[PDB]
Amino acid sequence: MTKPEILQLGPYPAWDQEPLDAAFTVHRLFEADDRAAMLANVGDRIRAIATRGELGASRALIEACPNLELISVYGVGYDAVDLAACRERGIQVTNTPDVLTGDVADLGVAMMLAQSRGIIGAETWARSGKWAAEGLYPLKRRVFGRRAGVLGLGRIGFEVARRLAGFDMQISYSDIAPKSYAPDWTFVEDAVTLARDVDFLFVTLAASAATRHIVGRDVIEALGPEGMLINISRASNIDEEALIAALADGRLGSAALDVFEGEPNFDPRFRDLPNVLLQPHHASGTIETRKAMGQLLRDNLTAHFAGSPLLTPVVLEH
């Protein structure tokens, strides 16, 4: 009988770990006192690596696993997997796409609403007792019927737009080209123009932006003193120095951010600003989404060793 041997690079939740350990002989590199010793011992045996978007899989690690067949990634991104090393060797790669899309879009829209309607401060207002002792919470700003732009209209951006339509917003978007699935929303070529004409701008860029889609000083300034920036996609696509200065100056009205450079050790200055909603990178943070991601990782591994097609490959066998 066989329990295929796999190398796991970082921890997973128990609901994935248990069935992984039941089906496979799992070597936990992240629990090893000595990396080289474990690789010497089991490297030859490793037929698959189970990793995470963050951790990836280096060339040296791949070289230490000469009989490697598959690297399965928990998460959407797989930047840190050495693809050239994989393609040289006929190693296939899978990820876990699609299962997080709706929850990410939900949090983005929720964040816009929370910042615009001052929900954080309003909770504190009632909880602290200032509602009774002082009076009314200050009037906040309407969302419905106003103008929203979506920067990047892929899976996530599309789902955001669908949610915004239920609020009767005037929706525009920018991307590399118009999308066939956006017949009722206005395509805009560049991020500056997009920002100029909207009250709320969602950054939902799945990859490293092209120049005209990067969120720098010009885009931020065009978004304007009563505009709001909502970011639920990678930190690298926003100039944080430009963002902080604009928020401080009043050149940008407000921001709601779920992702930050160097997170969780995000720039302390974001804490000092009165117009910033902070979230701890949990746009995909639901029980259902995380279970689905883990299930997909496991289903790819199961399919591979069974001789069945991979569910969600990102690299073919070359």
Side-chain angles (χ1 to χ4, degrees):
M1 62 78 62
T2 71
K3 295 189 60 180
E5 305 201 36
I6 73 177
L7 188 67
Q8 183 177 327
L9 305 190
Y12 294 130
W15 55 55
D16 295 317
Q17 195 70 59
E18 294 163 36
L20 278 166
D21 279 320
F24 305 114
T25 301
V26 180
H27 304 285
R28 304 181 183 193
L29 192 57
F30 62 94
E31 277 181 13
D33 67 330
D34 194 272
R35 182 187 169 94
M38 172 169 280
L39 292 181
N41 290 346
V42 304
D44 282 345
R45 304 201 182 269
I46 302 311
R47 291 173 61 198
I49 289 170
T51 190
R52 291 164 67 110
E54 312 160 62
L55 308 170
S58 67
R59 175 175 292 273
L61 176 63
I62 289 162
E63 292 169 310
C65 301
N67 300 307
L68 188 62
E69 298 169 6
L70 168 66
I71 300 168
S72 285
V73 181
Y74 183 102
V76 180
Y78 54 96
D79 53 324
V81 175
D82 190 321
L83 301 191
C86 288
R87 291 192 180 98
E88 286 168 6
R89 296 177 157 72
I91 297 161
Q92 298 171 78
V93 184
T94 64
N95 66 340
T96 66
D98 296 323
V99 292
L100 58 55
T101 299
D103 277 323
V104 171
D106 279 11
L107 192 74
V109 174
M111 287 165 63
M112 168 188 64
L113 287 158
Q115 184 57 33
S116 198
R117 300 297 300 271
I119 290 181
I120 299 301
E123 228 285 339
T124 302
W125 198 254
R127 190 168 299 274
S128 70
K130 298 189 197 189
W131 183 22
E134 296 197 32
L136 237 106
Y137 190 59
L139 298 178
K140 301 289 165 171
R141 297 298 303 273
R142 175 178 299 179
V143 170
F144 82 94
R146 298 184 65 198
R147 303 165 303 171
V150 182
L151 179 56
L153 203 84
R155 296 160 166 83
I156 298 178
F158 181 63
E159 289 308 308
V160 167
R162 293 178 71 238
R163 286 145 177 78
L164 301 173
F167 291 83
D168 292 339
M169 305 191 82
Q170 309 165 63
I171 300 160
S172 48
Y173 71 100
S174 186
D175 209 316
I176 197 59
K179 300 296 180 181
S180 61
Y181 48 79
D184 299 315
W185 307 322
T186 304
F187 175 76
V188 183
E189 293 280 1
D190 74 304
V192 171
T193 306
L194 180 66
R196 183 186 49 105
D197 296 333
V198 305
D199 305 297
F200 304 94
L201 179 64
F202 290 83
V203 184
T204 47
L205 290 165
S208 317
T211 306
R212 68 177 170 276
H213 296 132
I214 297 167
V215 184
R217 174 178 268 249
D218 289 336
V219 173
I220 294 165
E221 288 194 343
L223 185 46
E226 298 186 13
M228 178 188 306
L229 185 71
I230 303 96
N231 190 21
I232 52 181
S233 64
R234 60 184 62 173
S236 60
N237 279 330
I238 301 180
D239 184 336
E240 293 194 359
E241 288 294 342
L243 177 55
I244 291 165
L247 289 160
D249 285 350
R251 285 180 287 118
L252 178 60
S254 63
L257 306 174
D258 188 56
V259 62
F260 308 83
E261 288 288 354
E263 64 183 26
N265 299 114
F266 68 89
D267 204 303
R269 285 173 300 172
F270 281 123
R271 198 177 271 108
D272 303 328
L273 299 157
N275 48 350
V276 175
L277 181 73
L278 305 167
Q279 299 281 277
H281 207 162
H282 74 142
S284 69
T286 66
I287 299 172
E288 193 159 5
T289 283
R290 295 305 172 81
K291 282 185 183 183
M293 293 177 43
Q295 188 68 60
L296 188 46
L297 171 88
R298 294 184 280 110
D299 290 345
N300 280 290
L301 290 164
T302 299
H304 174 79
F305 288 110
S308 292
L310 297 176
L311 282 77
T312 49
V314 293
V315 177
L316 293 195
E317 182 179 1
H318 288 275

